[PDB]
Amino acid sequence: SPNSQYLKTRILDIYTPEQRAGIEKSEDWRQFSRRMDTHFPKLMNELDSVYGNNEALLPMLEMLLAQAWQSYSQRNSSLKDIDIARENNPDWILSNKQVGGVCYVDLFAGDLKGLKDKIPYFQELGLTYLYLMPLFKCPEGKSDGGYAVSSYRDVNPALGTIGDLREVIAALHEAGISAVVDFIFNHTSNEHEWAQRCAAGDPLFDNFYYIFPDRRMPDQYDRTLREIFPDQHPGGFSQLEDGRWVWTTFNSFQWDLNYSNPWVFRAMAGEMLFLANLGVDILRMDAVAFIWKQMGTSCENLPQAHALIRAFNAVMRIAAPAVFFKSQAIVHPDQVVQYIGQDECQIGYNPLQMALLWNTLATREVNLLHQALTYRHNLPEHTAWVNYVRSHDDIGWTFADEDAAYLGISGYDHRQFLNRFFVNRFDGSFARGVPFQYNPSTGDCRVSGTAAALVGLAQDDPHAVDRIKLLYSIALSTGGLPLIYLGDEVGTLNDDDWSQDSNKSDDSRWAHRPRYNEALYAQRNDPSTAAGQIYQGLRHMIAVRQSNPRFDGGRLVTFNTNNKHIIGYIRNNALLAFGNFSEYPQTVTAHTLQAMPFKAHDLIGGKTVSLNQDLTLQPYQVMWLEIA
Ligand SMILES: *[C@@H]1O[C@H](CO)[C@@H](O)[C@H](O)[C@H]1O
């Protein structure tokens, strides 16, 4: 295995003796050289555990590092100042000052020029993080909402140009907002240049995807493969016009990239460097679970998958230190947490808390949520959770069956109930969601629908507004970076005409991806409307989170409320949070509150509450008590 000093002299070999002496004395090389010495051993070690003694490893590594230097040299100085800042402040993600938001540029603002006009609103809401959905070129028609990339360099013409994106990112930075986008790396479209060339037999793009001659290997892999979209195709394979079969974990038009080929890592690390120099602060690493395949296994969460992410991390620590990663792993809780590490993905989605928030709204019992917050919330140093209520995706009931079994709950039967409840197929249900990917072969099903539709705002349930304020309060105060699905702050309902659209009809996720509702946003300052009650309710919680230091960090200690309907947790041994998940008044007795001080100020309602007597919480009431 080669060292950092050796490879650095090979990088400088492209320069003539006269200009080489000039680069060695420059500030850009002094920083790159320091970061190479510190972070290259990790890059070498991770790439070695995956590729081993591959002939292509050394030539790939040298090509990658040469490209990494050119990328850091070309990098803007304003971005180099953010590199220095975050290199010396790894806990910026754990700060209570951070509140995030997510939206589709076309649905929320039309185009990129329209999005920069929406920036004063993001500042009004108090956002310091903005996640933009797939901006790059995708095929016309079905593209999985932009998740089938045809070109990582060209922006979708309907949204604008590559220059318009640089202007948006710079305008976000001036407003004190971090730019977050997707790094669609597990797969590309079947219309991508690499895809067409690999299938055509071009030797430069050989083994870039997993192409098989018949059903022999696909049948053997399918014995252990989980179906993500069973409505589209069985297993994880799709057929071409010539008779060959290709690995398609998702849609038929989304072909899985082959990370067993060292050249695919290089190709994708080059695409990462491009995104880094645009000014992107955090990259969303979707489908991190599927980047490595092996016969006999589920081809999910394999050791080499984690090692490849850690290798990508090292490329960033060397050529763009400001670029952090956000893991999206909608898998078993034991596997979700393994992607989170300072040397892997610094932040990651929290599907467990999210799914259990909805479960608790259905059952009215906090048992599962309490268990999750007590045993699975705390993370290692320099890492944070991305807590959310809703996303562009469906809700999967990804709680642990083993955790549920300890509480006397059968995982299969509980998911049967939750799915029936949330799609309005259970008596007295307030939820108005629609099914997504019902698999008759497994009994598994996911739920589509906005936060407002699932709490009952569509039929004007009087408890609906309070339910949204309750779910968001947990995401905003548990510890981690909260991500608001833009449109939820005004109670936006489902898109009614998704089902009668040929390009959207086979994907129920479009029910929860509606356009910017002008009418609801114009009612945001009116306390008499549902939209105004939700906005002012959420805005108050955001204001309190950002100004009060008691919410700092990602750590928590749960509090036993002795009431199965009320959740309780303590932040920094100074903030006691209570959340009633029942539609009836619930009580935390004087007995349970004996250790707490006599009086405590509530940050939600503003009243001074006595804890020396019985505390009765109103239907879906949230209380943030200052106990120190
Ligand atoms: C992550 O990626 C999958 C496949 O591209 C997409 O369907 C999901 O919506 C996205 O979050």
Short mmCIF file of all heavy atoms in Angstrom, two decimals, residues 199 211 238-246 255:
data_model
loop_
_atom_site.label_atom_id
_atom_site.label_comp_id
_atom_site.label_asym_id
_atom_site.label_seq_id
_atom_site.Cartn_x
_atom_site.Cartn_y
_atom_site.Cartn_z
N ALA A 199 -24.31 -1.14 -21.93
CA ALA A 199 -25.18 -2.11 -22.59
C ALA A 199 -24.80 -2.33 -24.05
O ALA A 199 -24.97 -3.44 -24.58
CB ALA A 199 -26.63 -1.65 -22.49
N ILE A 211 -25.23 -6.54 -15.40
CA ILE A 211 -25.98 -7.11 -16.52
C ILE A 211 -25.71 -8.61 -16.62
O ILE A 211 -24.56 -9.06 -16.60
CB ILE A 211 -25.66 -6.38 -17.87
CG1 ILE A 211 -25.91 -4.86 -17.72
CG2 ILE A 211 -26.57 -6.90 -18.98
CD1 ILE A 211 -25.38 -4.01 -18.87
N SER A 238 -34.88 -6.41 -13.93
CA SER A 238 -35.72 -6.02 -15.06
C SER A 238 -35.07 -6.47 -16.37
O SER A 238 -33.84 -6.55 -16.46
CB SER A 238 -35.93 -4.51 -15.10
OG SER A 238 -36.61 -4.07 -13.94
N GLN A 239 -35.89 -6.76 -17.38
CA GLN A 239 -35.41 -7.22 -18.68
C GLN A 239 -35.29 -6.11 -19.73
O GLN A 239 -36.10 -5.19 -19.77
CB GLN A 239 -36.31 -8.34 -19.21
CG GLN A 239 -35.75 -9.12 -20.41
CD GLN A 239 -36.53 -10.38 -20.75
OE1 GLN A 239 -37.75 -10.44 -20.62
NE2 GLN A 239 -35.81 -11.41 -21.19
N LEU A 240 -34.27 -6.25 -20.57
CA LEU A 240 -33.99 -5.32 -21.67
C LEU A 240 -34.66 -5.85 -22.94
O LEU A 240 -35.18 -6.97 -22.94
CB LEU A 240 -32.48 -5.23 -21.91
CG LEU A 240 -31.54 -4.99 -20.72
CD1 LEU A 240 -30.11 -4.83 -21.20
CD2 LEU A 240 -31.98 -3.77 -19.95
N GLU A 241 -34.64 -5.06 -24.01
CA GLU A 241 -35.23 -5.46 -25.29
C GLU A 241 -34.49 -6.61 -25.98
O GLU A 241 -35.10 -7.36 -26.75
CB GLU A 241 -35.33 -4.26 -26.24
CG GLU A 241 -36.57 -3.38 -26.05
CD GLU A 241 -36.31 -2.07 -25.32
OE1 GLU A 241 -35.29 -1.40 -25.62
OE2 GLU A 241 -37.13 -1.70 -24.45
N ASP A 242 -33.20 -6.78 -25.67
CA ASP A 242 -32.39 -7.84 -26.26
C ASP A 242 -32.46 -9.20 -25.54
O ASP A 242 -31.92 -10.19 -26.02
CB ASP A 242 -30.92 -7.40 -26.46
CG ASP A 242 -30.22 -6.94 -25.16
OD1 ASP A 242 -30.64 -7.32 -24.05
OD2 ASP A 242 -29.22 -6.20 -25.28
N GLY A 243 -33.12 -9.22 -24.38
CA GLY A 243 -33.27 -10.44 -23.61
C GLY A 243 -32.44 -10.54 -22.34
O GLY A 243 -32.65 -11.44 -21.53
N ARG A 244 -31.49 -9.61 -22.17
CA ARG A 244 -30.62 -9.58 -20.99
C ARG A 244 -31.33 -8.98 -19.78
O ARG A 244 -32.33 -8.28 -19.92
CB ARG A 244 -29.32 -8.82 -21.29
CG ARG A 244 -28.40 -9.53 -22.28
CD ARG A 244 -27.08 -8.79 -22.44
NE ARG A 244 -27.27 -7.44 -22.98
CZ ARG A 244 -26.36 -6.47 -22.94
NH1 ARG A 244 -25.17 -6.67 -22.40
NH2 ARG A 244 -26.65 -5.28 -23.45
N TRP A 245 -30.83 -9.32 -18.58
CA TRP A 245 -31.41 -8.83 -17.33
C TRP A 245 -30.44 -7.91 -16.58
O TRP A 245 -29.24 -8.18 -16.53
CB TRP A 245 -31.84 -10.01 -16.44
CG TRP A 245 -33.01 -10.80 -17.00
CD1 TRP A 245 -32.97 -11.71 -18.01
CD2 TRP A 245 -34.38 -10.68 -16.62
NE1 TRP A 245 -34.23 -12.17 -18.30
CE2 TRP A 245 -35.13 -11.55 -17.47
CE3 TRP A 245 -35.07 -9.93 -15.65
CZ2 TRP A 245 -36.54 -11.69 -17.38
CZ3 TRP A 245 -36.48 -10.06 -15.55
CH2 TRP A 245 -37.20 -10.94 -16.42
N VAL A 246 -30.97 -6.83 -16.01
CA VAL A 246 -30.17 -5.85 -15.28
C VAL A 246 -30.69 -5.62 -13.85
O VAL A 246 -31.90 -5.71 -13.61
CB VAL A 246 -30.08 -4.50 -16.08
CG1 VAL A 246 -31.46 -3.86 -16.24
CG2 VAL A 246 -29.10 -3.52 -15.43
N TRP A 255 -31.14 1.85 -13.17
CA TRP A 255 -30.15 0.78 -13.14
C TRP A 255 -29.11 0.98 -12.05
O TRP A 255 -28.47 2.04 -11.98
CB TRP A 255 -29.41 0.70 -14.48
CG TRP A 255 -30.16 0.23 -15.70
CD1 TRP A 255 -31.51 0.02 -15.83
CD2 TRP A 255 -29.59 -0.04 -16.98
NE1 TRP A 255 -31.81 -0.36 -17.11
CE2 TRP A 255 -30.65 -0.41 -17.84
CE3 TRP A 255 -28.27 -0.02 -17.49
CZ2 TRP A 255 -30.45 -0.74 -19.20
CZ3 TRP A 255 -28.06 -0.36 -18.85
CH2 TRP A 255 -29.15 -0.71 -19.69
#
